[PDB]
Amino acid sequence: DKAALSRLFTDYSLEITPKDVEALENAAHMIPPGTLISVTFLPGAEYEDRARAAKRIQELGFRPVPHLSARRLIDEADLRTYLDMLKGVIDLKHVFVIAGDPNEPLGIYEDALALIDSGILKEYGIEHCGISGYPEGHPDITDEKLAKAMHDKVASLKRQGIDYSIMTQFGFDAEPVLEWLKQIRSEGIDGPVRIGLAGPASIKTLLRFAARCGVGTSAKVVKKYGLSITSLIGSAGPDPVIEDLTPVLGPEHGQVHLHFYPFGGLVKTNEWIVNFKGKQGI
Ligand SMILES: Cc1cc2nc3c(=O)[nH]c(=O)nc-3n(C[C@H](O)[C@H](O)[C@H](O)COP(=O)(O)OP(=O)(O)OC[C@H]3O[C@@H](n4cnc5c(N)ncnc54)[C@H](O)[C@@H]3O)c2cc1C
């Protein structure tokens, strides 16, 4: 259905790392102006690397969304270093706040709530704060703690007058995404959601990131998505999830868009998006 597919693909977003600025310039011509492009907060980059990438996103006509990784920050002064530097070069209106992967925080922020609820985002004029969602749960956090954190972060942003959205962990199956969308809307969370999708990539790369991010690969999912090490193709794209979601999304799911992780490369990911949309007639 072209209508349901166009709604899902409306205002789709991208993630880049600070190492991807040249690839972004090579892909920019394929990217709709104003596209939201997030910037990871992971080891191997300094603040100026991250700010440079955010500034390039804006200059190319897109909207940067810097990630803030709470457990990777020492103190408020450390976080302000990054926010000050961002604010001087970009229209700092959108951030995405996560706890961060280390099992031990480096500083005063134990999780995304600690950062969000400190007030620092309002002080810098942030209007939109994204938070995480895990349709398949999390290897180190209970479903209960995941749900309470979502509630508490939403309540904190509501208290502060800052809009929120959710971007989900990528997955290889539409069923847990559809069931989790029901659960969170049943729990009162009605804000916009972006379903994370792994871009087209080699099966080895997909299994690698999936293992490193704790994303499940059951036997039935390996068969349906096409993630066998015996594959004759050797690569896989997210069309099986998209084609399973598109007929089944309805009004009760609220606003539901897509977020692509370009694990196979940014140019390759955007080519796939353009070609997929063309094949489907949207
Ligand atoms: C879209 C998306 C983007 C991401 N981007 C980044 C990124 O740029 N950089 C990065 O470092 N990580 C990133 N992550 C990963 C994220 O940091 C980890 O999944 C982390 O383990 C959980 O973060 P969270 O914000 O979901 O946790 P929160 O919602 O802040 O925490 C949920 C609950 O679990 C508790 N908790 C938090 N961490 C742990 C832990 N390790 N063990 C036990 N309890 C815990 C919290 O106190 C809270 O009670 C991203 C994840 C997603 C889905």
From Swiss-Prot:
Catalyzes the NADH-dependent reduction of 5,10-methylenetetrahydrofolate to 5-methyltetrahydrofolate. Is required to provide the methyl group necessary for methionine synthetase to convert homocysteine to methionine; the methyl group is given by 5-methyltetrahydrofolate. Is required for Sphingobium SYK-6 to grow on vanillate or syringate as the sole source of carbon. Keywords: FAD, Flavoprotein, NAD, Oxidoreductase. One of its GO terms (biological process) is tetrahydrofolate interconversion. This is 5,10-methylenetetrahydrofolate reductase. Belongs to the methylenetetrahydrofolate reductase family. SUPFAM superfamilies: FAD-linked oxidoreductase. Disulfide bonds: none annotated. It is an enzyme of class 1 (oxidoreductase). Disruption phenotype: Mutant cannot grow on vanillate or syringate as the sole source of carbon. Mutant retains vanillate and syringate O-demethylation activity, but accumulates methyl-tetrahydrofolate as a result of the THF-dependent O-demethylation of those compounds. FAD binds at A45, H67, G100, D101, A112, Y134, H138, K153. Pfam families: MTHFR. Signal peptide: none annotated. Its EC number is 1.5.1.54. Its cofactor is FAD. (6S)-5-methyl-5,6,7,8-tetrahydrofolate binds at D101, Q169. It catalyses: (6S)-5-methyl-5,6,7,8-tetrahydrofolate + NAD(+) = (6R)-5,10-methylene-5,6,7,8-tetrahydrofolate + NADH + H(+). GO terms for cellular component: cytosol. GO terms for molecular function: FAD binding; methylenetetrahydrofolate reductase (NADH) activity. Pathway: One-carbon metabolism; tetrahydrofolate interconversion; Amino-acid biosynthesis; L-methionine biosynthesis via de novo pathway. NADH binds at Q169.
